Amino acid sequence: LWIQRINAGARLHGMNYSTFINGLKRANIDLNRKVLADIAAREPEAFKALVDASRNARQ
Amino acid sequence: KTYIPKNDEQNWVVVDASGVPLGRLATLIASRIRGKHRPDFTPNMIQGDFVVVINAAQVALTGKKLDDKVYTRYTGYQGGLKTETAREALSKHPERVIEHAVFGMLPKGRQGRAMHTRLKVYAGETHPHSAQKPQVLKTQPL
Amino acid sequence: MKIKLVRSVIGRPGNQVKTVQALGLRKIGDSREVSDTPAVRGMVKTVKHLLEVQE
Amino acid sequence: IQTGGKQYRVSEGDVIRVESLQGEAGDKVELKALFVGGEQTVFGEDAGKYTVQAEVVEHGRGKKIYIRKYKSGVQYRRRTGHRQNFTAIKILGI
RNA sequence: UGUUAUGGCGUGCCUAUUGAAGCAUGAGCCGGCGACUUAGACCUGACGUGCGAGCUUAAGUUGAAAAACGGAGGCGGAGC
RNA sequence: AACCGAACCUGGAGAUAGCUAGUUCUCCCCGAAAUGUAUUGAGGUACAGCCUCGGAUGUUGACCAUGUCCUGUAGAGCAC
RNA sequence: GCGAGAGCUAACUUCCGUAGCCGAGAGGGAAACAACCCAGACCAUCAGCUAAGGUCCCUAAAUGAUCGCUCAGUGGUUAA
RNA sequence: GAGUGACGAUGCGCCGAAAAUGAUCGGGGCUCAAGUGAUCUACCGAAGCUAUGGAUUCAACUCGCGAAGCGAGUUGUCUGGUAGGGGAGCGUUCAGUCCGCGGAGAAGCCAUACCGGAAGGAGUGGUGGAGCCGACUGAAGUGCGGAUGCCGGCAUGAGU
RNA sequence: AUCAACGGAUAAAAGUUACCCCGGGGAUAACAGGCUGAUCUCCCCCGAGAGUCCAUAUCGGCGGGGAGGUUUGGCACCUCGAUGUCGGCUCGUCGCAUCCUGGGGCUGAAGAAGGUCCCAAGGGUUGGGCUGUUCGCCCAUUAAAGCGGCACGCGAGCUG
Ligand SMILES: [Mg+2]
Ligand SMILES: [Mg+2]
Ligand SMILES: [Mg+2]
Ligand SMILES: [Mg+2]
Ligand SMILES: [Mg+2]
Ligand SMILES: [Mg+2]
Ligand SMILES: [Mg+2]
């Protein structure tokens, strides 16, 4: 359920779960994992920030 | 703990079928019908959008429309109650080709069946505008 | 010589289970520093395919 | 979470797995992994600068569960009790 | 706490068996009844206690709101 | 005397039953076998093997290396 | 599975050898599915990483990147 | 007027290719790869590994005690299981002992969201209307879903 | 001591049961199904030779590759606390490897009548004599008087 909500929002900001998570992993600093689904669902402002950070640590 | 929903929204989408490969189009509709990007993101109920298909007759099929694509639909006690039709032969029902490809990629239970109410297929372009008094937010395939 | 059990002992021949026991590895992930002696290098070659070898 | 919080909570008295600092106001400081304090959003190690402050409210046993196990035609039936121990913590930090 | 919608998951029980949801056996349901015991101065072992290089009584006898007596005999004690 | 290749009733009698069924509170620790040889034996049984508990011993057990000996399969070959 | 006999170089066949699993083994995968593949379940959690297997929708996760092949739905019924 | 004909190797494909209830690769659908050869990463994915909390087994190490040993307490380790073996206990009747309770309400019955690791145990309330709980120790006709089990009551078929 | 049934039951011992009885076994046969497919049925390959001449209009030695699952079997997996067993009748439905009828190609097709192969399962596929018969033989017709599956389809449907 958690993963489903993540890639839904990840795809809202031109990404996807696979990619997004790798970004947060590549930005070692980011280790949300648990909680991460609620941010996507309730805090869209905040979720976007984490998408933008994930995009950096990758490409 | 995890977040649940509301229902104040009922998004209506207007996908065009024109030249899109059948299954390729189908996928987009089935996902937007279930809960792809999902409002509150929950599976105990329907969060899905009301897809409206237009240009059903102008849909695309690869190497075989004449051969291979055969809609088997076997009637009452099969006392040779075995009916088959080529996809080309579905010039009678273009709306049922899209319809009975999309339902094929949907859950099949009590809820799943409830989901075929959301899909509303039409063969025309300007004439489908029947169920088009609510929202008409056009979303292209890819 | 760093050695770690990466594959399960289930479905693997007796001798290989007995070797993996001698090497003191009890779970998957279990890692240990190893001797460069011919017999201890010899144990590690018997069950090579079940272990991840660093050096 | 995995034990020991994070996040932009408020002044909430939540329940977590046992902390050892027995009795009331045993004071606990939390690492923090994200925050929305004053709408300002910041994540990992940049959030690590900041910390959360907690006060050990109580020590308790979680609602009794019963661990039941069954294997068919083997006459295998198991019945055992269970109660998970927790530490309730009042949040009141940065 | 009760109840309810929808989602996921999900092959009664026992027996017998290489293999039971099995279209193999049994059983309508509930209540009650319903299956490893007792004996012997028997044999052999674990635990235990009392005396201990020794230990012990049987039948009986006398007292019985109760136990004492009774050494006939039995076992260690030498084997081949 | 409503079921006769030897009536019915009571008893011996809880006949025998290597066969079928059934065998009831709980948690914990270990945990098999379906093999070998014999059997008027082959769906039974004796001894071993395999399990478990207690005692003794206390590295003798396991794997792997080295050293040594044993061996006629795979392949090959046509000297029998 | 591997190594043989029997058998038609048949059998979900039979009888040995040898390894592993089921028997007594739950969990993931293989649609479903004792045995195959991964992996051996002390209990709790609305945490994290991986195996075999996967990442269009049903269904978790790239409708991934690059150079090629096939146009028969081959893929997704065997030979001379 | 510019290349063209034959033996062979190989990759993927073609024909050869007919069985009985209705079809299909699980399905939808797929060549505008969701097929397929090769290389490469990123994610999913189990009761495996990991995080945190707790319990058990064996062990070595501390100690409460007149000693062994039993309790506690670390640390390590263990904990799938059929036949079977080993350990610790729960419950029922009767008994001896002690502490009690009861017509201002005993047993039994009924309801319940409480306690204990389990067998189980308590509180409160309701019924009942005269006996009974707890603790230690002793003894058993001591624990049932099965036996086409026995006795009894009541269902189904059926308003047939 | 051919106690040789050779770890040797007594010194001493054959048959029969359709009159049969009990305890069991799907540990084990007969029916059906399942797996297999030797045999069975069909189809394909090669082309010796027959066809006055010409391998292939028809035919196809010796030999080779498949398919089917209707035969006889093999095997012994569910069923022995019961899966009624041949034929008929009644009732159907389904495969096509098509008996008729429909469309074709080749012919050793002048025509008419055929032969043979391909496509095709819509409907059709007679009544008697003999035998329990399925089968088969005969009589008399027919466009034709098909071969198979469905527990050798069908007994809580009938016969016996
Ligand atoms: Mg039986
Ligand atoms: Mg009797
Ligand atoms: Mg071949
Ligand atoms: Mg009963
Ligand atoms: Mg048969
Ligand atoms: Mg018969
Ligand atoms: Mg013709």
From Swiss-Prot, chain A:
One of its GO terms (cellular component) is cytosolic large ribosomal subunit. GO terms for molecular function: rRNA binding; structural constituent of ribosome. The keyword Lipoprotein does not apply. GO terms for biological process: ribosomal large subunit assembly; translation. Keywords: Ribonucleoprotein, Ribosomal protein, RNA-binding, rRNA-binding. Belongs to the bacterial ribosomal protein bL20 family. Binds directly to 23S rRNA, probably serving to organize its structure. Part of the 50S ribosomal subunit. Contacts proteins L13 and L21. This is Large ribosomal subunit protein bL20. It comes from Deinococcus radiodurans (strain ATCC 13939 / DSM 20539 / JCM 16871 / CCUG 27074 / LMG 4051 / NBRC 15346 / NCIMB 9279 / VKM B-1422 / R1). The gene is rplT. The chain holds residues 60 to 118 of 118 of the full protein.
Curated annotation (Swiss-Prot), chain B:
It comes from Deinococcus radiodurans (strain ATCC 13939 / DSM 20539 / JCM 16871 / CCUG 27074 / LMG 4051 / NBRC 15346 / NCIMB 9279 / VKM B-1422 / R1). The keyword RNA-binding applies. One of its GO terms (cellular component) is ribosome. Keywords: Ribonucleoprotein, Ribosomal protein, RNA-binding, rRNA-binding. This is Large ribosomal subunit protein uL13. GO terms for molecular function: mRNA binding; rRNA binding; structural constituent of ribosome. Belongs to the universal ribosomal protein uL13 family. Residues 124-142 are annotated as: Disordered. The gene is rplM. Disulfide bonds: none annotated. Part of the 50S ribosomal subunit. Contacts proteins L3 and L20. The chain holds residues 30 to 171 of 174 of the full protein. The keyword Signal does not apply. GO terms for biological process: negative regulation of translation; translation. This protein is one of the early assembly proteins of the 50S ribosomal subunit. Binds to the 23S rRNA.
UniProtKB/Swiss-Prot annotation, chain C:
SUPFAM superfamilies: Ribosomal protein L30p/L7e (SSF55129). Signal peptide: none annotated. GO terms for molecular function: rRNA binding; structural constituent of ribosome. GO terms for cellular component: cytosolic large ribosomal subunit. Transmembrane segments: none annotated. It comes from the Bacteria. The keyword RNA-binding applies. Pfam families: Ribosomal_L30. GO terms for biological process: translation. Keywords: Ribonucleoprotein, Ribosomal protein, RNA-binding, rRNA-binding. Binds the 5S and 23S rRNAs. Part of the 50S ribosomal subunit. Belongs to the universal ribosomal protein uL30 family. This is Large ribosomal subunit protein uL30. It comes from Deinococcus radiodurans (strain ATCC 13939 / DSM 20539 / JCM 16871 / CCUG 27074 / LMG 4051 / NBRC 15346 / NCIMB 9279 / VKM B-1422 / R1).
From Swiss-Prot, chain D:
Keywords: Ribonucleoprotein, Ribosomal protein, RNA-binding, rRNA-binding. One of its GO terms (biological process) is translation. Signal peptide: none annotated. It holds the Pfam family Ribosomal_L21p. GO terms for cellular component: cytoplasm; ribonucleoprotein complex; ribosome. InterPro entries: bL21-like (IPR028909), bL21-like_sf (IPR036164), Ribosomal_bL21 (IPR001787). It comes from the Bacteria. One of its GO terms (molecular function) is structural constituent of ribosome. The keyword Ribosomal protein applies. HAMAP family: Ribosomal_bL21 (MF_01363). NCBIfam families: L21. Binds directly to 23S rRNA, probably serving to organize its structure. Part of the 50S ribosomal subunit. Contacts proteins L15 and L20. Belongs to the bacterial ribosomal protein bL21 family. This is Large ribosomal subunit protein bL21. It comes from Deinococcus radiodurans (strain ATCC 13939 / DSM 20539 / JCM 16871 / CCUG 27074 / LMG 4051 / NBRC 15346 / NCIMB 9279 / VKM B-1422 / R1). The lineage of its organism: Bacteria, Thermotogati, Deinococcota, Deinococci, Deinococcales.
